[PDB]
Amino acid sequence: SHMGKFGQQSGAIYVGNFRVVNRHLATHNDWANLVWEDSSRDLLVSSTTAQGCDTIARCNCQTGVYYCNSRRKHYPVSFSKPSLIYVEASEYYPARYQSHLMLAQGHSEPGDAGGILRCQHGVVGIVSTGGNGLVGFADVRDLLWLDEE
Ligand SMILES: [Zn+2]
Numbered sequence: 001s002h003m004g005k006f007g008q009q010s011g012a013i014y015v016g017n018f019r020v021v022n023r024h025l026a027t028h029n030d031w032a033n034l035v036w037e038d039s040s041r042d043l044l045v046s047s048t049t050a051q052g053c054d055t056i057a058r059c060n061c062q063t064g065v066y067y068c069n070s071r072r073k074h075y076p077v078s079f080s081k082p083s084l085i086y087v088e089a090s091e092y093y094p095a096r097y098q099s100h101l102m103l104a105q106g107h108s109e110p111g112d113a114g115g116i117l118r119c120q121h122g123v124v125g126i127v128s129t130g131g132n133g134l135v136g137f138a139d140v141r142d143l144l145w146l147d148e149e
Helices: 028-032
Strands: 013-022 034-038 043-053 063-068 073-078 083-087 096-105 116-119 122-131 134-139
Touching: 013 122, 028 034, 028 043, 063 122, 063 134, 073 096, 096 122
Parallel strands: none
Antiparallel strands: 013 043, 034 043, 063 073, 063 116, 083 096, 096 134, 116 122, 122 134
């Protein structure tokens, strides 16, 4: 019994002809094939040729399970709704307010960004931030165009 689906953990969400990755980890190839990006959400979407098997959740769940790479293990989480959160400077961004970010208590060290959070409806978001015993997930549920055709 689990608080969310187990699915692929490729470091990116694959749905329809889209690949959703942490903007700060997007590869040179992602940028050559850019569909959409938002620095304030730490999200980038690039285009693909082949159908991805993830389902994007369209719910208001505040519980789910994510994969933590540093522990090589899944954890159930309770997270706050998507909010505007102050994220201090890193090698990837200056200090700024990051929007659509969902906070939970959880392990999240550098390297853990890209871990996928799923509820029982599908993919909810992707690990983006960490620190002070918290893990922050970039929500993708509001992206209605992000789907299959
Ligand atoms: Zn849900």
